[PDB]
Amino acid sequence: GSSGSSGTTCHTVKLRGAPFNVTEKNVMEFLAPLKPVAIRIVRNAHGNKTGYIFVDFSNEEEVKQALKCNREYMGGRYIEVFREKSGPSSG
Known part of the structure; x- marks a missing residue:
């Protein structure tokens, strides 16, 4: 309803290029x-x-550093990290 006001969102990162045997663990060790x-x-x-x-992360730093780990290889496929400007996606 005629909305529109910039407001820092919950920093969020996206990870793609993962196998079928990937789980929360792999992601943790990958983002670690x-x-x-x-x-x-x-x-x-x-x-x-x-x-x-x-x-998702608590402080921006954690996220900013998450990008550092680019062009990595885990599980058995190329992974590509990207910073989601928007942030939240689910719902």
Whole structure:
């Protein structure tokens, strides 16, 4: 209703290029030593991990550092980290 006001959002990071045997653990060790708040795995329509994992953090730093770990390899596939400007996605 005629809204629109900039407001710092909850920093969020996205991870893609993960195998089928990927879990919250892998993400933790991948994002480590950083420690996120909640690791939400993108479950496609038919429930399937299609190279996509939403991870949130407490302080911006943790996130800013998360980007550092770019062009990495875990599980058995190339991973690409991206900073989600918006932030929240679920709902």
